[PDB]
Design a protein around this ligand. Sequence first.
Ligand SMILES: *[C@@H]1O[C@H](CO)[C@@H](O[C@@H]2O[C@H](CO)[C@@H](O[C@@H]3O[C@H](CO[C@H]4O[C@H](CO[C@H]5O[C@H](CO)[C@@H](O)[C@H](O)[C@@H]5O[C@H]5O[C@H](CO)[C@@H](O)[C@H](O)[C@@H]5O)[C@@H](O)[C@H](O[C@H]5O[C@H](CO)[C@@H](O)[C@H](O)[C@@H]5O[C@H]5O[C@H](CO)[C@@H](O)[C@H](O)[C@@H]5O)[C@@H]4O)[C@@H](O)[C@H](O[C@H]4O[C@H](CO)[C@@H](O)[C@H](O)[C@@H]4O[C@H]4O[C@H](CO)[C@@H](O)[C@H](O)[C@@H]4O[C@H]4O[C@H](CO)[C@@H](O)[C@H](O)[C@@H]4O)[C@@H]3O)[C@H](O)[C@H]2NC(C)=O)[C@H](O)[C@H]1NC(C)=O
Lengths: 245, 43
Amino acid sequence: SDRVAQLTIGNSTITTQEAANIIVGYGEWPSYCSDDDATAVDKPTRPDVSVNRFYTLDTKLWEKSSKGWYWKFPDVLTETGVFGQNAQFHYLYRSGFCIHVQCNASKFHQGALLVAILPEYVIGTVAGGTGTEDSHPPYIQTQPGADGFELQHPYVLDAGIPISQLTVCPHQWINLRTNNCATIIVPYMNTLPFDSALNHCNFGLLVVPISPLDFDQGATPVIPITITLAPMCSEFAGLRQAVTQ
Amino acid sequence: GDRVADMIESRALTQALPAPTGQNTQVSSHRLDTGEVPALQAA
Ligand SMILES: *[C@@H]1O[C@H](CO)[C@@H](O[C@@H]2O[C@H](CO)[C@@H](O[C@@H]3O[C@H](CO[C@H]4O[C@H](CO[C@H]5O[C@H](CO)[C@@H](O)[C@H](O)[C@@H]5O[C@H]5O[C@H](CO)[C@@H](O)[C@H](O)[C@@H]5O)[C@@H](O)[C@H](O[C@H]5O[C@H](CO)[C@@H](O)[C@H](O)[C@@H]5O[C@H]5O[C@H](CO)[C@@H](O)[C@H](O)[C@@H]5O)[C@@H]4O)[C@@H](O)[C@H](O[C@H]4O[C@H](CO)[C@@H](O)[C@H](O)[C@@H]4O[C@H]4O[C@H](CO)[C@@H](O)[C@H](O)[C@@H]4O[C@H]4O[C@H](CO)[C@@H](O)[C@H](O)[C@@H]4O)[C@@H]3O)[C@H](O)[C@H]2NC(C)=O)[C@H](O)[C@H]1NC(C)=O
């Protein structure tokens, strides 16, 4: 009654029969902006079906020597579907997300992942190596899009913060002896109630193998990791022509 | 004319309901719920 689930929203459902449990980030569901909070005076659009779908984005192969990946949300979906068309026309934006990452393996493979969220995941550099040149990260390390980006130094998460206490932020583990998926429901976290969808990326989805993959030779050596996400309770405002960046 | 208790103790599952039209489709919403799964059947 906990191992088996089904998440239907929009026209797309996903079934899982070896889940762990759904955690709701910071204990509350995504919701619409109340009139106590809103400052924009134009009526928002709320598509309510066409953008609240599980978008399956990409597939990272996980071998025995991987480091970890990250996806900046919502810039994984400003190139995809009716979410990517409404977020490019409209200046303002708010939504929550239901984030579901699948990674199946046999009952002989082993290894654990820490799929975790963290809001305002800013990216530092190696500062020129020795630490004296103020190098800023490029635009693709900042906002990789639906392609994702691989961590260089996952012990410090490319930001000088340790991964050992990433477990404070909303997370759950995918260890291949127990579960194969990890649902994380995230509300809209930001100070101001709407923001731009092209500039500001509210959070980043860190997916790091902490305990590495291991399997005896003869088993299937290709163990993919696919993340599917669904913008919940999304609404846009401030209509103008299409910007792409 | 017996004293034995073996002899003295010695049916459809489905009901035909009337269905003139095909059944309606009620309004559903999303659901994010563990435990119960309507998709995963056992064929
Ligand atoms: C001029 O001159 C110049 C100079 O020379 C030249 O150049 C060149 O070029 C060429 C071409 O390109 C080249 O060659 C190539 O190479 C490549 C590479 O190699 C490298 O690298 C690798 C990598 O590794 C990785 O992975 C692994 C696993 O796999 C792991 O373990 C590790 O760790 C790593 O990891 C990393 O990375 C990754 C990526 O992804 C990531 O993710 C992670 O994170 C990490 O970081 C390596 O390994 C290698 O190493 C080597 O070496 C060393 C030394 O030190 C040793 O120790 C080792 O062992 C090795 O050795 C081995 O191996 C190799 C291979 O690799 C071989 O060759 C040798 O002999 C030995 O055995 C390196 O460093 C490669 O890849 C390639 O190969 C390919 O091809 C060939 C022919 O061509 C063949 O034969 C092979 O087989 C292969 O094939 C494959 O692949 C493909 C593509 O990919 C595919 O498609 C196919 O299908 C296949 O697959 C298959 O098979 C396999 C087996 O193998 C299996 O597994 C699978 O499953 C399937 O079935 C090539 O070779 C070169 O290099 C260069 N050079 C140099 C020096 O380098 C030029 O060219 C000229 N010019 C003209 C015009 O000519």
